[PDB]
Ligand binder design. Sequence first.
Ligand SMILES: Nc1nc2c(ncn2[C@@H]2O[C@H](COP(=O)(O)OP(=O)(O)CP(=O)(O)O)[C@@H](O)[C@H]2O)c(=O)[nH]1
Ligand SMILES: [Mg+2]
Lengths: 470, 134
Amino acid sequence: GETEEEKRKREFEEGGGLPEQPLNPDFSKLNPLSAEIINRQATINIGTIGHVAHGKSTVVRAISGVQTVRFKDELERNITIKLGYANAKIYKCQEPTCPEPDCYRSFKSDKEISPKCQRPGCPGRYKLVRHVSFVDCPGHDILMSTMLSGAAVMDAALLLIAGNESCPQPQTSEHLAAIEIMKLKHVIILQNKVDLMREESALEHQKSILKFIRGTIADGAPIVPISAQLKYNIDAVNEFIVKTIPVPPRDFMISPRLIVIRSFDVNKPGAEIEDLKGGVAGGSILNGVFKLGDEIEIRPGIVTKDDKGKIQCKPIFSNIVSLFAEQNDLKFAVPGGLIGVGTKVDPTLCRADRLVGQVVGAKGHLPNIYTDIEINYFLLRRLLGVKTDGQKQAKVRKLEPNEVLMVNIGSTATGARVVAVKADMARLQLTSPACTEINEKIALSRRIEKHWRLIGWATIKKGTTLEPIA
Amino acid sequence: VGLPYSELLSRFFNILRTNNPELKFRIPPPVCLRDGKKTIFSNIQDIAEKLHRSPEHLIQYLFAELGTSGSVDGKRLVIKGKFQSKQMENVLRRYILEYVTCKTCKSINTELKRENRLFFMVCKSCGSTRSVSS
RNA sequence: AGCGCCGUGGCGCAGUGGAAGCGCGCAGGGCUCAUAACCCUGAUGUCCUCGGAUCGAAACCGAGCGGCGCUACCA
Ligand SMILES: Nc1nc2c(ncn2[C@@H]2O[C@H](COP(=O)(O)OP(=O)(O)CP(=O)(O)O)[C@@H](O)[C@H]2O)c(=O)[nH]1
Ligand SMILES: [Mg+2]
């Protein structure tokens, strides 16, 4: 006669609950799979890429169970500018007796340490092999800065192709090439629509997809047929993620840094202001272990124009109120997972798209903002994302001096002007501030057909620095 | 290596043949009555059932398509206006095309739900969340 | 999530602090040999729910519902 809520509790405490992280653990001996890290935060970022209006939120929801929700009334239905986040817990059945393909199980973020096996007949429990974060990348032909930046966040890739539609989707290839630009190989190919094809059609589509993947850098990409709607064949996707995709090199040697992609003001309306909370930067950490209570500086931050038209850059100093990751407040932050760093910053900085693609450094490091950047570029033969009706996919021209182009430096979405063109080298002048820390893999897009179009990649070689005003 | 792709494709196809042997064909023929000044549609309840659709939402959608007024009588809709059975059949065809069955895949078991004030659709066979209200 | 609007008689506005309104609709009658035009009579309401001062509220207010526009995604 136990209520379902009582049953779920009883299982949760039976599954070990969610133990509180130690305040000060010995960080030298901590690995991303450690019990304190693995249970309460996501160590690998997996990103969804696909054609427009085929379903990339739904696949993530079928995997984990965490809704991207989708917002902004008009944007509820067409496309969403911001990224879609979700946490999945990867659980493997400890019983060898159960078949290997279905032992894997991806649960929501609130599951216990060892939940029971839903397979009828197995009393074995589930061990947590990893926790993963998901970065839903918009796949529209107009929205390109967010996709490049979300790529710049993630560490694993997930390609979706629909079966009944034409095989060569162009912006899917654009997504794949963008992934290849940032130095990722680990891509898993998904067939979203398989129930709606015949046996022969599905095999023909697989043959086409294989025929596409011969010249690209990625060679041994796994292909698996799934269904976001019917919600089957989830365990083998977890299998492929666990086997094919290891943890990128990420230890505690590298100095602390942050890369903010999203801004979230925390102002619960209707509530009295005497009970409020700071402003939260949704940022990803590729390097740096952050602990509850820290002073950090948003390097590009305040961007002002004086009476003389010169751009002044005031870094946003800030003290971390909390490091919101996964479900609960955590004492320490793990590199390789998106986290809401809530700080004392005024929420008007985190209301709209203001902190989208901005570098941050804790106090004890001095990254450099720049105004002119030397850049080393290399382009492809043709533009990706244009369905030419049978005629020679548009060839990339050579860049012209004084042309406004979108230069995605890591996460920063900036529109720069070319001041000189060389054989392989260029110089970009920026009006929207950009900093340089180490290399910041860069994506390049031009304006040839109204909306932005990817052309090629680049890395900064030099730049003219600016000294922030204290 | 795409070998371990065809096997799970086979597993999915066996899943499909197990769950859905039948793979709409359940639209009642809209036999109407045009009594000159009046029009009576008795099938409104049957088309409500065979499409798994609640009556009030269907009849208000019918009134939203065509600006004609009447009442609901008895398990039937009594609208005093002029329409051939072909045109009301066409309106029901539109409602069937865009509400009872999704355009992307063949399904029908979805029904009305209210997810922050509108009518947000969800499915049962799949688990869809689409914002169809107008 | 909060704020701006609303709670039909089939409709739209309304007086909203004496308790059922006006026009458009619809049924019926009148004029005409006859039709339209014109002229008269109408039955339709929980004027959305719950409580409260009030002889009394539909009106004046509030402890809930539903539908509308913005603040805009408000961890
Ligand atoms: N038939 C079928 N429909 C699907 C499948 N996956 C998703 N859909 C459909 O896609 C719709 C959701 O699309 P959505 O995830 O919003 O697309 P999107 O991710 O915003 C496209 P983009 O990433 O470019 O912005 C659902 O209503 C659902 O019916 C599938 O495997 N089969
Ligand atoms: Mg998304």
